[PDB]
């Protein structure tokens, strides 16, 4: 019997054992997230430990089948994923050091507190304490205090850890035959051995930098319009040619500019489209919301929710006594069990979230027939892109009017059209330079291109140059500002938010063209279009089985990430911004800082 046939048989046994053990851990995890007790924590950890220990045993056993002697690519994908899972490449001592560091950074982030000057007993955490300040406060000093205190008392704690974190992560990645830990992360996009669809890890950097260049003009005029509106609100604090102060950007890091809408709204006398009143008027509950979201997916040819979904999901807050983790999540426990955890309120925002999360469930159900190790999005940006496009259609006035939540006597005008796109751009476009510049800095740190003594120097040189954002206080190398964001100190890659954003508009443009949508892309609703649903489904049911380049081509007809649909979606705003900035300076000078 060949080594490929031995691997097929081994994978057969793994698929069974993993499916059962994974289900036990997911269910135990579910029972805690919906009913927070001490016993449910123990059951979640026991079931989790058993699953982790099973994955470590099977990772080692998988490596005893060398990849070079398998020809079946579908088998080699599964074998590689199980082999690439184990960290048994670093000595037990260095593995132990690295896990302690990871735990310490995560603990510092989640329990880091800041106490108000003049009272040691009034102390705030990041959430909800400091996040409330950075998202609602208009006082320059209060926001500057929250911004600086978070970085100087929690960030400085993370600097010595992150330094050792980089060294060990590189050692682990190098010993897995990657250039560095940044190259390891880019491994998610790699494709090999499929002629016409291959993709190298280093190609991701070039495609990200090539697509980002075509985003700069839109971002420059967004940044120019935002700076002008803030300069009116803070005339003594903002230069007409300088970068935007980092603490005046709507949250702790400026990752999203969403909360600047009140100070930047183009036409403040036209109200937003809010259907919350109409939902309460019609006595909608949570079940009605998800029932409507189910109807949406059925209208395009996708299946209805399983009976187990409605029985086992938790769609409303459990109650006062029973405490829950209300973060909206879609659960694929395996063995036909799909659920949504969500503390739904009768609001437009939760209504769109229901479509977003049920968009994940549709993805999960569609690739449930794939092998266990291939039940995932095509790459790290696919799954979230699928979720987002559902809330794009679900929110249009066209879709809202057809379900009886928006009055037929409400007609769109280009002022509310511009208000919408600006609000969208503040979230979608604003995060792109933030996301690219954060990952570029980490890619360069892992590569060794940034010495330790110039970490925070290069970080703010790249914030000013790339993002047009300037620190309000000088920061030396005792700081670790990147680590003051969750994803940096909690060891998650970050470029997925950039690729997903580009994918989601490639998807929506393609599906709307299949829906024969007439008009600007941002007004499109794929509802009732079974041809659109079929195009999407042909990619969903693939899972990880096919190269992400091929899966993308199934929907959009191109093998690579493209930024033209994103620019297409925002084109009405782009022309309106350029006309707004006709007597403004566009671009920023990096030498100006608020601390003179």
């Amino acid at each position: 019997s060949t080594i490929e046939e031995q691997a097929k048989t081994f994978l057969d046994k793994f698929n069974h054992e993993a499916e059962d053990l994974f289900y036990q851990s997911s269910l135990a995890s579910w029972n805690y997230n919906t009913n927070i007790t001490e016993e449910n924590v123990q059951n979640m950890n026991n079931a989790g430990d058993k699953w982790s220990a099973f994955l470590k045993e099977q990772s080692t056993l998988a490596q005893m089948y060398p990849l070079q002697e398998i020809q079946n690519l579908t088998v080699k994908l599964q074998l590689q994923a199980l082999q690439q899972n184990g960290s048994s490449v670093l000595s037990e001592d260095k593995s132990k050091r690295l896990n302690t560091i990871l735990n310490t950074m995560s603990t510092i982030y989640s329990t880091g507190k800041v106490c108000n000057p003049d009272n040691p007993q009034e102390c705030l955490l990041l959430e909800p304490g400091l996040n409330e300040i950075m998202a609602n406060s208009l006082d320059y000093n209060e926001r500057l205090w929250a911004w600086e205190s978070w970085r100087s008392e929690v960030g400085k704690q993370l600097r010595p850890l992150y330094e050792e974190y980089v060294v060990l992560k590189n050692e682990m990645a190098r010993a897995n035959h990657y250039e560095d830990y940044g190259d390891y992360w880019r491994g998610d996009y790699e494709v090999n051995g499929v002629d016409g669809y291959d993709y190298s890890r280093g190609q991701l950097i070039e495609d990200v930098e090539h697509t980002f260049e075509e985003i700069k003009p839109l971002y420059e005029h967004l940044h120019a319009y935002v700076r002008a509106k803030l300069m009116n609100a803070y005339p003594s604090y903002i230069s007409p040619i300088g970068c935007l102060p980092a603490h005046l950007l709507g949250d702790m890091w400026g990752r999203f500019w969403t909360n600047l809408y009140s100070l930047t709204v183009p036409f403040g006398q036209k109200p937003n489209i809010d259907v919350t009143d109409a939902m309460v008027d019609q006595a909608w509950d949570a079940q009605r919301i998800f029932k409507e979201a189910e109807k949406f997916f059925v209208s395009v040819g996708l299946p209805n929710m399983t009976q187990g979904f409605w029985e086992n999901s938790m769609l409303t807050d459990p109650g006062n006594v029973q405490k829950a983790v209300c973060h909206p999540t879609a659960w694929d426990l395996g063995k036909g069990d799909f659920r949504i955890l969500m503390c739904t309120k009768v609001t437009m925002d939760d209504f769109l979230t229901a479509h977003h999360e049920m968009g994940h469930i549709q993805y999960d159900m569609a690739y449930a027939a794939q092998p266990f190790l291939l039940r995932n999005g095509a790459n790290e940006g696919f799954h979230e892109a699928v979720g987002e496009i559902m809330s794009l259609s679900a929110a249009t006035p066209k879709h809202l009017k057809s379900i009886g939540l928006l009055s037929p006597d409400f007609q769109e005008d280009n002022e509310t059209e511009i208000n919408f796109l600006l609000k969208q751009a503040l979230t979608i476009v604003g995060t792109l330079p933030f996301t690219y510049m954060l990952e570029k800095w980490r890619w360069m740190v892992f590569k060794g291109e940034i010495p330790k003594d110039q970490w925070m120097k290069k970080w703010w040189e790249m914030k000013r140059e790339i993002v047009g954002v300037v620190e309000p206080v000088p920061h030396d190398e005792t700081y670790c500002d990147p680590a003051s964001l969750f994803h940096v100190s909690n060891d998650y890659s970050f470029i997925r938010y950039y690729t997903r954003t580009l994918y989601q508009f490639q998807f929506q443009e393609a599906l709307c063209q299949a829906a024969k949508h007439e008009g600007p892309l941002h007004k499109c609703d794929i509802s009732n279009s079974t041809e659109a649903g079929q195009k999407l489904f042909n990619m969903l049911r693939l899972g990880k089985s096919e190269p992400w380049t091929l899966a993308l081509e199934n929907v959009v007809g191109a093998k690579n990430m493209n930024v033209r649909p994103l620019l297409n979606y925002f084109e009405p705003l782009f022309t309106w911004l350029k006309d707004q900035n006709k007597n403004s300076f566009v671009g920023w000078s990096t030498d100006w800082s608020p601390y003179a």
């Binding site: 081994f10 069974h16 059962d20 289900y23 399983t306 187990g308 063995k335 036909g336 069990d337």
Partner: protein, 195 residues
């Protein structure tokens, strides 16, 4: 007026694991087929060779009742000319099969919150099964080229695996009870006619 022991087979407390499927030979009785519709809308009743449409005016030499438990997905494999872990390694119907396949969802009985590991099925075998064959061997499957020495290890797998039935599984992974009625016609007097 001797009534055939179907309540024995269908309403049994515990069905057999499909790898060790259970056969009940039926003879010398009146077969009241037309009264079998007493389950939770029993999800399957498909016959091959004969007609279920009130064709119990027919006599057979012996009737064999085969019973086991599989998951919903696997019920499609209890039919002539199907392949899969069940039809290849546990229970195989012949190409010229004459009889009926009855199946119904038994989630309320055969599922359990901690997971019901009573029901097993065969995952590995050197070759497929001949029609109506039964293999209950617990010999370690040699997947590699080294001998196994009767213990589980690298490339040496215990040939049987468990269904781990839980009530919250999807319908495709829920337990289904199956009864396979095999009708025999030998050159011998019919002992089984059912009015």
């Amino acid at each position: 007026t001797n009534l055939c022991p179907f309540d024995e087979v269908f309403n049994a407390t515990r069905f057999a694991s499909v790898y060790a499927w259970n056969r009940k030979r039926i003879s010398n009785c009146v077969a009241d087929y037309s009264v079998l519709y007493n389950l939770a809308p029993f999800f399957t009743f498909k016959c091959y060779g004969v007609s279920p449409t009130k064709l119990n005016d027919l006599c057979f030499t012996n009737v064999y009742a085969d019973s086991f438990v599989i998951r919903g997905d696997e019920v499609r494999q209890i039919a002539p000319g199907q392949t899969g872990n069940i039809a290849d390694y546990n229970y195989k119907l012949p190409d010229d099969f004459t009889g009926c396949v009855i199946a119904w969802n038994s989630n309320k009985l055969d599922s359990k919150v901690s997971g019901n590991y009573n029901y097993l099925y065969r995952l590995f075998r050197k070759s497929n099964l001949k029609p109506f064959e039964r293999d209950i061997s617990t010999e370690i499957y040699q997947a590699g080229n080294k001998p196994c020495n009767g213990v589980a290890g690298f490339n040496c797998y215990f040939p049987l695996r468990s269904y781990s039935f839980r009530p919250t599984y999807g319908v495709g992974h829920q337990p289904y009870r199956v009864v396979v009625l095999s009708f025999e016609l030998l050159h011998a007097p019919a002992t089984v006619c059912g009015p």
